[PDB]
Design a protein around this ligand. Structure first.
Ligand code: A1B2J
Ligand code: ZN
Length: 139
């Protein structure tokens, strides 16, 4: 679990969005596993606007942060799960690191701010949904 709170927006994994997220929907994209909902309170986070390919993410299944080198946002095949059919997920970045299903929502940050959230995992792989292209989160 986990969310980004920026301005009057909350960014979560689309597959983990609550009834309240859907009732306050701003934007969602099943191909990116993202959903943004509106909030009344002002958010705590800053979004990175950069091309960093290294950063640190929070891994809830280890209660720890780990440094990672990750690929640029790309279209990657993701196998079927209980939440989605087998498909290509867009704007996804892969890295070598620990991940378990409940780790989705952990934040990835670089020196400039929030880069994205955990969205997928493999055997020693972790995938992050990028949010750096969503410029409207800042206005
Ligand atoms: N974005 C998606 O399509 C998600 C939806 C929820 C499910 N999903 C995952 O990848 C969940 C996952 C499976 C794992 C794992 C880690 C995770 Cl995060 O490591 C060991 C093998 O099995 C795809
Ligand atoms: Zn950066």
């Amino acid at each position: 679990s986990g969310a980004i709170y920026v301005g009057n927006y909350r960014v979560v994994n689309r597959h983990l969005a609550t009834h309240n997220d859907w009732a306050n929907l701003v934007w969602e994209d099943s191909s990116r596993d993202l959903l943004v909902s509106s909030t009344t309170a002002q958010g705590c986070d800053t979004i990175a606007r950069c091309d960093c390919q290294t950063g640190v993410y929070y891994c809830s299944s280890r209660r720890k942060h780990y440094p990672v080198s990750f690929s640029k946002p790309s279209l990657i095949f993701v196998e079927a799960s209980e939440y989605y059919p087998a498909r290509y997920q867009s704007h996804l970045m892969l890295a070598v690191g620990h991940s378990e299903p409940g780790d989705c929502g952990g934040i990835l940050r670089c020196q400039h701010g929030v880069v994205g959230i955990v969205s997928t995992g493999g055997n020693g792989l972790v995938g992050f949904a990028d949010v750096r292209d969503l410029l409207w989160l800042d206005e």
